[model samples]
Target: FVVPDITTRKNVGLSHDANDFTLPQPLDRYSAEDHATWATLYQRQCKLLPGRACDEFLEGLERLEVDADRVPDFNKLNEKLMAATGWKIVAVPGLIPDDVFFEHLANRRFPVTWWLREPHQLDYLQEPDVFHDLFGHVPLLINPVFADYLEAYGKGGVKAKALGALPMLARLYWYTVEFGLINTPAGMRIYGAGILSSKSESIYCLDSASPNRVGFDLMRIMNTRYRIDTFQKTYFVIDSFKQLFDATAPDAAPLYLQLADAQPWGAGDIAPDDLVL
Candidate 1:
């Protein structure tokens, strides 16, 4: 028989919330293998990201002193993070309820997965693990503008759920937080944590010609669907973090109602109005 998933195990009373999942790191859980994996992943990304990742993200990793030799301590990182942008990291078993996730972000807390992926599952895992959460998502939180954008996105979640626009809000997250890019004076650089954390996607998203790099349009993104299991076929490019914050600031309730009758574009489909490059 197949084993039950983590969500199911939780319902069966086999789970525990590492209370204040944002507390000090549980150093005891970092096996030698885990450290090795962290180091390998770190080295690989560092080598691959010089021209790819945004400057702020790279600098945040350095300013925060995220250890390349071992898994980082959330509490220690928070000292720097809180001082910088009033953001902190919280650990969770895996994916939490959407509302809970938003609540954490709304308060400047980023929920990270507590467990590490096994050595054998290095290429990818279905759900996010600690490495992906901390390394991928947290660094950019140090930027004030981007931090505010996240908070606004979180607050929008409540409204999205109320109006049955969660799917729309999710698309915004997928496009911005997961697969978004930014245009820098040097050229295009990545801001999306999802692509930053992945092994293959990081290469494909920037180098491949298969995907469409469209200007970031709030309504267009909200009306688009995304593919979670594969490389994104379209990446929304933002001029600046301020643009993201401003776009979501306007109450989206009316927008959602407006989109209620419109059919969404498929993950791989691009609209005719999209600025193709």
Candidate 2:
């Protein structure tokens, strides 16, 4: 049922405010089966994640005191998150409009999908659920530099939209926030939410050599396409969290226009100028 229409699987009868686009966490709606699903997914990722995931990512979870046994109550988590990075998590029925999403991130609000996958679909689901949103993305919000990059990304999005560069900006987010890699003194590690949440990707990202592990290049990433249905053929690498924040801090207008007339590389193609690691 994940094919052709994944969004249809989300919870029904949920609503959010038009101004802020936030909804209550829908805690009552989460079933016992849902908590069990969260536990199983959490355990699987915990076993898979160790040295593969960056230290800050793992530490952020511990610092935030994220619930390991059940789906967390957002408000309770907010008590700590707000004090840490001035960021807070809010529930959304599912995905929201792009501008709406940007607005939340710009203001330090993260929109999380409030539902969980069915027990049968524990290993694979087409859409994001509480486990993916909270466990994967929320933890890193505690990292100051990483958190700043996200907030800047949100602010940058509003400008990108006005300049008709949202697609290029989207690729930047995909390659960095969703499926990025970090090169630590310990060797390569992952900070990407997409890879962090998936059991297989968490392994393939650092251990496998099938994918192109290119050094992080902002222009190259913005000019590339990505695949969602399978393991990525390429993963961008960043040396440090500061690199991510600095690379994206400037005006992208020039780069956006520069790439406007150029042909984008396919998901599997390595750029001629790519700094391959």
Candidate 3:
């Protein structure tokens, strides 16, 4: 008569402190249904993601041999991921404070929720699940340049938090790592995990003509707004992973100070200076 709660802080046996959410991925806690759900999501994305996803993303999955049939063991996945780029995924109950989240990334440790979504919630969930963390984000971590950008973003979090400019930097992560596109010789392709992991988004992000695909701009991205509840109205496009890393190379504190007085662009509003690719 009661549905088992598998992933909340209490159910997963995590501390109440918002600042401390790390736990060994209770892999043994996963149900058969959970594995089935992972397989379903994995199979769906793999079939359609070939051309839509960036080459590095697909390659990373193959190289890691990320579990095709069930939720992967985080320790096992880390072996390949670290060997590739010195990054590892850690398990968290869900969202942690920006500072804690950034600290992990700064240290090259990615925090992933250690639960699968309920079958009924398959198509959507407000909070990130294992699918979003591992499938959507992990593949790109194998990339050296993308990996560098993430590490820098993590390191910059401390400065942003100190300046009370985390909102601006969060917007940058929202638009780029979560929903960014990359331009290729063939055409534009998806590199964002939000798009990469979703069946509907993976298709709409590339094929749709509705969303704005602007060139990646450091200041512009920091000054933008994003919506987590719906499809993005504008998706920034990067020319290459190197471009992403290069943009984050400079100290972000100065940029945050400069944008403190500037009004942020709406989630759907294209900036006047935007270079729509």
Candidate 4:
């Protein structure tokens, strides 16, 4: 609730492009404390994620060679990513405008926040940082199906913004990319970066009885609201990355028009149509 204005916080005296909000990784600017904070968060997640994260998520980390000891150089990570999925990570000062964000993703690029969070703020931070962007997200860019889904989501953004349906698209991003769950042979696992980054949600999402685990309905997610300060009340579950990618294959204009006059479901509310697990 008390999120800081983006400029009020610390930056390594780095500047970003005015249009795209991107900058060099500022590798030379990181300090001992910065690297230590990265290590601390990295070690904690590595220990916590194994069984909880989907197999592809863990394998993506290894295949990408994401560094655990220090903040990674964006170019270094991009090398492996491009070879695997034609995706690359770009360094951004922090969160950028949605248009700029979609442009990057539409072109198969991901904008990662370049700075690491302070040691005291490791558990939670007001914005995405090097750890959350690189550790939490970059790894999964290895999965071809998941990778394609993200690109399509970006392309869909252009139409949604024009349709005054940006909020609907955002809800879709929240439930799928940020806090989605996948039903696997082993059981439910975390794939959403928001859940993958948080220690508490990583465990609570699968183990807790409080949140509703529902099937991934494209329209349902677009109409569902989400919370930022709390764990999700309903976690949308996907059968596979292929299912997620396939959902975006249709035109979304008609869907947006159909929901234009309807109200959104509350952050925790379950619809009659939800396939509750």
Candidate 5:
């Protein structure tokens, strides 16, 4: 899927800061149809997510009082989110530059696209719309450990960029933040924003045998490749949220330098040391 260029994104008439690429939440731009679309999507996920989503994710949605009837106001959500974890969602046109994104995350600000997807594009969107950003990603930010993990990942961006190891870092984000699973006493549950946002993949990731479900390994994930256009070929499983935060706490400069010349594992290829399930 082709991402809309900056020119096309700017055509919406929202004024975003040149430096940060953030804008005021365009409340008036939302149509009644847009609210209905959000409601529909929310309802669909509510039905499918209970058994699949991690308890923390489900709890975050309720605790944050995320609106179920219409698109939520970023400021209103921030009132609760800031109180909980000192993280707030800021409005952006769509996806912003990587450096800007890292800066926002590092500062405990998350950039969410202000516009909702069209009704026809409800299930799938090439670029993350407001629904995808708010519904898919924001809830997890309520968790203190997960929130810190994101902030740490953001801070690490500079070192990764300087080392020209951004690809390896991106792989880590892909495997963990976007497509990760957690091993709960109840069973494996979804925590990754990418899977929690999709109806089909939510079920497929848990129930299907097609994708490899491997134990989380920091170095191994940094050396893995993932494709965005389809279901993930593998989902890394973490034992706990604290495990995720602790695993990535140390300096990654050494790891990146070590893997700088190594070949990344294919998305589906099980490494010899993999604790595959």
Candidate 6:
């Protein structure tokens, strides 16, 4: 079945709330199949994530007490999250527009998809569902520094959109939010939710010698193109969340203009000057 853009679906006679684009989670509406799917996905990722997922992400799961038995209750999870970093999970039907998504992040609200993937799709799905958004992505928001970096990235979106650099800014999100890695004292660890949630990608990203691990370059990332259908070919490495915050701190206007004529690296191509590790 083709996935529809769910932002337009009406609930209680409204499409989306004008202020926050959130609605009450229809918790009781979750079917038994949803619970089983959640549990299977949860257990698989949990077993796979240790050492690969950063320490903070694992801790957030424990502290927030995210359900391993079934889909989590947002309100229950938020009780712990609100105290940790002043963030809350807002439910969306599915992926929202970029502007609306960035606005939520800029305001310290993380949007989570309300539905779970079908049981048949336990391994893969074309679009992000509750598991990817809530399980994979949401945990790191517990870190104060990471939380602040997200807000800053969100605030930069309006400017990026205005400058026709949304594609560039998107690469920042794609490389970092979806597929970034970090250099920790223990070793390189997965920080990106996209990697953390997948059973195979989680292992392949760290253990595979085939993929290129490049030092995080803000300008180079913004100028690059990424493939959505396959495992990332190049993963950007950041020293710390502080580094991510610092990188996006400067006005990106000049950088975007500077990259206007530059060619982007192919999904599988490393730049001539890249620090390949």
Q: Check candidate 3 and list the clashing pairs.
A: none
Error (Å) of candidate 2 at residue 166 is 0.7
Higher lDDT: candidate 1 or 6?
6
**What does each candidate score in C-alpha RMSD?**
2.5, 1.8, 2.5, 1.8, 2.0, 2.3
Task: Please tell me which model should have the higher lDDT, number 1 or number 2.
Answer: 2
Q: In candidate 1, which residue pairs get closer than 3 Å at backbone N, Cα or C atoms, i.e. clash?
A: none
Report the Cα lDDT for residue 57, model 4. Answer: 89
- lDDT against the true structure, each candidate: 0.84, 0.88, 0.87, 0.88, 0.89, 0.87
Q: lDDT at 49 for candidate 5?
A: 96
Task: Compute each candidate's TM-score over C-alphas.
Answer: 0.93, 0.96, 0.94, 0.96, 0.96, 0.93
Name the lDDT value of residue 218 in candidate 6.
Answer: 93
> Compared with the true structure, what per-residue lDDT tens digits does model 3 show for residues 7-62?
55335444444565687888778899999999999988899998999999999888
Report clash pairs, candidate 5: none
- Number of the top-ranking candidate, with TM-score as the measure: 4
lDDT score at residue 135, model 1, on the 0-100 scale: 88
Consecutive 10-residue window with the lowest summed lDDT within model 1: 7-16
Give the per-residue lDDT of model 1 (tens digit) for 81-181. Answer: 99999898886767777887888888888988866777787888778888888888888998999999999998887888898888898899989988889
Q: Tell how far residue 174 is off in model 4, in angstroms.
A: 0.8
Q: Per-residue alpha-carbon lDDT of model 4 for 190-217, expressed as tens digits?
A: 9999989997899899999999999999
lDDT of 1 at 23: 32
Candidate 6 residue lDDT tens string, 1-277: 8653433332334455766667788887688988999999999998888888989899988888899998999999999999999999999877678889899999999999888878887888767889999999898888999999999999998988888888898899999999999999999999998888786888788999988999999988987899888999999999899999999788789998888778887877888788777
- How high a TM-score does candidate 3 get? 0.94
Clashes of 3: 0
User: Per model, how many backbone clashes are there?
Assistant: 0, 0, 0, 0, 0, 0
Candidate 5 lDDT, tens digit per residue, 1-277?
Answer: 9997633654465577999998788788778998999999999999999979999998999999999999998999999999999999999888788888888988999989888778887788767887778998999999999999999888888998899998888898888888899998899999888888896999899999999999999999999999989999999999988988898788899999999989889988999999997
Ranking according to lDDT, highest score first: 5, 4, 2, 6, 3, 1
